[PDB]
């Protein structure tokens, strides 16, 4: 308004100058950032000192002037000063004041209508508070603690994201008008943005603060700390009040934040799909990628794509590793040999060949590494630090707390180093059948011995006996381990050291881009294997909740419900741009051409034949009522259209619309066959399966341009087309062109025509056509 005119006058006055003009004309807009630094640069050494030296003055604070006049803030209220007319040297538009002014505002100043929005701004800390209040403390005890150091997360957070996915989110919620082009993360996560926008919209707020708080709401604070007991973010946030080196405040904190359940579910799904793809013999790679992209799962309220969560988590498991490798996702330098965990500290080496005779004379190649290396190892409640040297376990130290875990870790370590005579002459018990190739897929003798150990405890005892046994020398009695795993004995194993106190887990902020083979074995720029499919449990049955396996092989439904779902999918795919589609017809109010679509003609056979006419009447009625006015709900037409193919008739409509398989849908209420919500208006749930509706048109519910972006696209720039806003963008015609402003310092030309395909297929195919 008048303010706008004032801004224009100021811009004019400023352009009248020469230097300001040169700087606002030369270069791009990014220069602003630079200019933001050359100004207001001043620091101090000991702010505490200067704070006591300033607050000892009369007017140590600055403040706005017009805000005080408008607020009717007086001066010398009760013989105590609050401010005096002056001009700070830097701002030139602020006036000195005193701290008393801050109380005078707090006690008899202007009051806002409501302020509960704060609870949303700082949701993380109110969550901290609530989690604290729901704890049941317990007694206090004194003792020594085995605090192990390690990298963990201290802030419980749902839907952990990256930084590039946030710099955009901070715009579509707060400063939308200057929003950039729509990124994929937005089009995919629409309901999330809508939720974050419903709260911080049409509100008086400082937006920078909100953006900072959102960054904190989506940042898991990772720290390298000493830790004891279970590992959960709910505890690490207050670890300071649970136990130290000499004391422990017992308290139960198990039933809060429901975090690890999501991770175990994710890992179970990963295991399932990995096994599925392993069932194949020549395309397990593409099979696995398809199973991935053809799957989704729910998180709290929203539905997220699997491949999106996998690239955000940090669970170092032999399952997640494979998936993150298929999707080209980089990861850390962490190994995995069965259930145990490993990490290399130093050393090097290279593969080498050797053979062993299984029974009598049966040569079988097995490899090892020819050099010295040092490794940290972590099994359940047990740690170890060992070294391998030319097919031998040089030394090892342990700091666990259990005998069984301490024996299993030792055995798996011995195996990992190919130490012992068994690798030189295997036992009679093993045979060529147990060797490898369940159905053709070979198995190195390593995992063979692994399962041979997991089979019987006596195999483990014999393997341990393979390690040298001697008499416990004096003094070393405490640092010794028997065969049962006892801290001391009269005779103990060879080259072993024990101690109380776990080992400090190493750390490295490194990343590597690895690959894998057709047999599901990952490699890292070397002959070393980081993961495989033999290191996971054999198999297990689970009933996954709030998941979507939209893939034929990964499906249990019959041809009937599957046909219904595919018909709905096909009917939705016609929701794009271009004539002959439902949006253009609605705009033209051609409610009749919908009845003659081919998709309804393909779904008609599924309709109950004895009452198809009556239902048809009702459907057509509803459609006209919604279409004639313009107040329609896109989630109801897509439901009732399949019935409008036949001719109306007469009869009593009970209230339900049945198919030929005794499954119905009701027009207005959600059921198992067709459900949806105003929260997430971009999803359709049929028989549990989820379907993503494109965003081409927006009904009464959808209330922004976000619902139109999948209908627009970029095209060659045309200066003839008009320039418009982001709100009038809905009044364009399908197939038209229009210029527009995007983000900042950028203008482009858009066209309301969509592109069905994505790059995943157009590159891979053309590539495979080159290896011939």
């Amino acid at each position: 308004m008048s303010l706008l005119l004032t801004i224009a006058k100021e811009y004019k006055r400023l352009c009248q100058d020469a230097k300001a003009a040169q700087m606002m004309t030369v270069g791009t807009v990014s220069n602003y950032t630079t200019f933001k630094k050359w100004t207001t640069s001043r620091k101090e050494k000991n702010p505490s000192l200067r704070m006591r030296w300033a607050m000892s003055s009369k007017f140590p604070i600055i403040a706005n002037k017009r805000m005080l006049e408008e607020a009717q803030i007086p001066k010398e209220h009760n013989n105590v000063a609050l401010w005096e007319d002056t001009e700070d040297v830097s701002k030139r538009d602020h006036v000195l004041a005193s701290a008393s002014c801050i109380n005078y505002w707090n006690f008899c100043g202007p009051c806002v209508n409501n302020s509960e929005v704060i609870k949303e701004v700082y949701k993380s800390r109110f969550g901290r508070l609530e989690r604290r209040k729901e704890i049941m403390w317990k007694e206090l005890r004194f003792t020594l603690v085995d605090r192990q150091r390690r990298r963990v997360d201290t802030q419980p957070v749902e839907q952990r994201l990256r930084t590039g996915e946030i710099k955009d989110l901070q715009m579509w919620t707060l400063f939308e008008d200057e929003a950039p082009l729509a990124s994929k993360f937005i089009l995919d996560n629409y309901g999330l943005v809508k939720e974050m926008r419903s709260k911080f919209a049409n509100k008086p707020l400082n937006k920078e603060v909100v953006a900072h708080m959102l960054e904190k709401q989506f940042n898991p604070e990772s720290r390298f700390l000493p830790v004891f007991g279970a590992i959960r973010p709910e505890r690490m946030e207050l670890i300071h009040a649970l136990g130290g080196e000499t004391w422990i405040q017992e308290a139960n904190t198990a039933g809060i934040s429901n975090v690890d359940q999501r991770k175990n579910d994710i890992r179970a799904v990963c295991r399932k799909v990995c096994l599925a793809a392993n069932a194949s013999i020549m395309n397990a790679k593409s099979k696995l990628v398809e199973y991935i992209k053809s799957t989704s799962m729910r998180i709290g309220e929203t539905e997220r794509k699997l491949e999106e969560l996998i690239l955000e988590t940090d669970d170092v498991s032999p399952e997640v590793t494979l998936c993150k490798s298929a999707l080209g996702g980089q990861l850390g330098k962490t190994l995995s040999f069965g259930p145990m965990l490993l990490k290399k500290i130093s050393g090097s080496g290279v593969k080498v060949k050797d053979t062993v005779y299984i029974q009598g004379v049966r040569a079988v190649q097995f490899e090892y590494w020819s050099e010295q290396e040092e490794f940290y190892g972590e099994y359940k409640s047990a740690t170890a630090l060992f070294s391998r040297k030319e097919r031998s376990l040089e030394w090892i130290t342990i700091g666990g707390g259990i005998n069984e875990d301490r024996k299993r870790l030792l055995a798996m370590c011995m195996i990992f180093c190919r130490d012992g005579d068994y690798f030189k002459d295997a036992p009679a018990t093993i045979t060529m059948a147990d060797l490898s190739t369940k159905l053709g897929r070979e198995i190195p003798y390593q995992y063979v011995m692994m399962n041979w150990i997991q089979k019987s405890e006596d195999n483990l005892e014999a393997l341990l006996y393979s390690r040298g046994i001697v008499e416990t020398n004096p003094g070393k009695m405490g640092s010794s381990m028997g065969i049962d795993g006892s801290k001391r004995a009269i005779k103990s194993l060879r080259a072993v050291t024990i101690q109380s106190g776990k080992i400090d887990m190493p750390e490295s902020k490194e990343k590597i881009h690895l690959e894998l083979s057709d047999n599901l074995e990952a490699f890292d720029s070397s002959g070393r294997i980081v993961a495989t499919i033999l290191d996971l449990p054999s198999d297990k049955k689970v009933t996954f909740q709030d998941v979507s396996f939209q893939h034929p092989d990964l499906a249990v439904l019959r041809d009937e419900k599957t046909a219904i779902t595919k018909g709905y999918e096909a009917l939705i795919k016609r929701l794009g741009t271009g004539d002959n589609d439902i949006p253009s017809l609605i705009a033209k109010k051609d409610y009749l051409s919908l009845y003659n679509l081919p998709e309804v003609k393909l779904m008609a056979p599924l309709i109950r034949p004895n009452r198809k006419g009556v239902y048809s009447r009702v459907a057509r009625k509803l459609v006209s009522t919604q279409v004639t006015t313009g107040h329609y709900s896109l989630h109801e037409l897509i439901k009732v259209l399949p019935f409008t193919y036949f001719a109306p008739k007469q009869g009593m409509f009970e209230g339900r619309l049945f198919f030929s398989n005794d499954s119905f849908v009701e027009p207005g209420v959600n059921n198992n066959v067709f459900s949806w919500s105003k929260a997430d208006s971009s999803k359709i749930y049929c028989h549990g399966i989820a379907i993503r509706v494109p965003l081409v048109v927006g009904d009464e519910h959808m209330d922004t341009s976000l619902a139109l972006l999948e209908g627009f696209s970029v095209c060659e720039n045309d200066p003839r087309a008009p320039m418009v806003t982001r709100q009038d963008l809905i009044d364009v015609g399908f197939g038209q062109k229009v210029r527009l402003f995007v983000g900042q310092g950028s203008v482009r030309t858009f066209k309301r025509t969509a592109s069905q395909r994505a790059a995943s297929s157009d590159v891979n195919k053309n590539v495979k056509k080159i290896k011939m």
């Binding site: 308290a251 720039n717 482009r748 195919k765």
Partner: protein, 696 residues
Amino acid sequence: SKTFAEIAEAFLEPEAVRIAKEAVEEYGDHERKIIQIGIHFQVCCMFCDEYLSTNGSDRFVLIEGRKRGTAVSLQNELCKSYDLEPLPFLCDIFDREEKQFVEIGITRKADDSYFQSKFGKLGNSCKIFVFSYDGRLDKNCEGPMEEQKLRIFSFLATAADFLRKENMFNEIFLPDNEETIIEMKKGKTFLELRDESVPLPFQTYEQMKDYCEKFKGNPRELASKVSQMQSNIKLPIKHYEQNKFRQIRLPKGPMAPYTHKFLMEEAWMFTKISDPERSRAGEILIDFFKKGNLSAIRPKDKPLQGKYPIHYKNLWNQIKAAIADRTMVINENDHSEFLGGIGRASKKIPEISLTQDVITTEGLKQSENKLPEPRSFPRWFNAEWMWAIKDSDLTGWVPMAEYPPADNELEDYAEHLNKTMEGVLQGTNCAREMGKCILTVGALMTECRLFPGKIKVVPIYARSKERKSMQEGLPVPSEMDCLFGICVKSKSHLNKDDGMYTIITFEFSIREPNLEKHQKYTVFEAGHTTVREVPLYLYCRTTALSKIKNDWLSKARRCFITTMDTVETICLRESAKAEENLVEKTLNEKQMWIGKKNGELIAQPLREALRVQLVQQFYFCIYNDSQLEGFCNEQKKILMALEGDKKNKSSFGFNPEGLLEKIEECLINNPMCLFMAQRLNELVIEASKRGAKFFK
């Protein structure tokens, strides 16, 4: 991040990434070009779009991703089969419905230069399409399919946004054909220098580069030089057991006198009851003035010791007068000007206005810094240390905040222990000195901030609370305001930190002085005071302060933190070794050595030994200087050697004599260093009866 490949993987498919990587590896070019190539390749892919011909067959064929030789082989194969002319150069894609190759280009500059160069290079032989990241297109034929254009422009827009966000949207990562050679603009002067800073045997950076890039390891010469250097050195190794530590040689001379601004043991104070209404200093200084005792004082012109007594007497009279005027202000006279150094600063003389005759007139040599002079061991320090251990007849000397609520056993334990310790410590004498310093320094800082360029009057006071007797008698004990003396500032124009503003101290005492200790003071005989009647003395001196000492003295509550840390640590360690609450027992039973009496050792429970550590920390806060810093920094070696001796660890060293020298170098006219050094000598002596590595 951390590599261009991971970056490209952000908005590209890893397949094309690997392709362009293998390509650059083939040509062995800088991997910063992974991006452009991948982009071009992906465009080609999305340009095919799996379109088909009338015969249900693929329409477009891709050749860019293939090797160069294979690509040319296929090019010639197609030029032959379909009977087309062979092209001189290679292309990217070929179509069948038209039977003519097609070349794709890309650029960032919004100009036709790239398309003009390409069209000149290839004329009109085949179809060329150059897109722009900012929505432009230049070609030599009919436009491509619509979907292709849409799909290409959208991808390019996303990529350009990402790059601009990563600051890589420049010629470096997106160059044209020509601007593909980036290099540091090596000038002339820089080279002239580089060829001059080379080590001696070489004379040009080229020789050094050739010697380093081809350097091979010769372990034998290395070992030979190692041994040679190992023979001409003869590094001494000295096991302490054989080479023991002598005692420390303290300096010699007069005794180190009192240095603290305020008196602690010799201080006398007048007390009254505190009213909440009148709580400021400028008010209490008048309240104490009305009753007449502050005015009953009337010293005489004959001092027991000191100098400039006339100035001090006149200043005291002016102080009394100003107090009577209800204005804590003083006028600028000759006396105050002298005892304030108001005109002492030197008058500058520029050199441009200087000459030899002026110098010869009045010698203007370089200032001869007069470093401090040595001192001797003070014999009055133990007296103050023992006096600062006893109660003071009151408590609450140091203000403290309140205790918050509690919900778990942890906070209960903490509050209980903290209450015990605070109640034990708040009753001592060192505590009242801490509170005195706190409040007086706060008042002085406020005044220096508000009333500079003006001589003021500030009291030396404190606030406390009489102890709590049984319920019998008068319950709810009252509070008390105590006054030990008067203070005065002088134009604290603190233009800069570390500055100095002279002050003056008028204190009350009932104990005659000593020449060695109370050397700087100038005492007067004032009169008599009650308790019966006893004589009265007036200790007077001069000193200065600064912002830093003010801020730190005001923050003198850290000693509590340190002491609590030590005590709680000891108690928790003793309690954990037995897995039981052993805190009260450890405080009432565990004995700690304190000192010697009659040649024997003395001990008392920790509950009473806390006071020693508290006084130690307070003195560290008071007498802190560079000397004490260096001393306390160089004494750790001795303690570590002692610990090694206790555990039979055969310690050793390279040159202990130098360590003793460094230590004894920083012992000058600072009482705390001398006292602690003598005590360290006594420590090593007492331990020699139980340990080695020390000489007598």
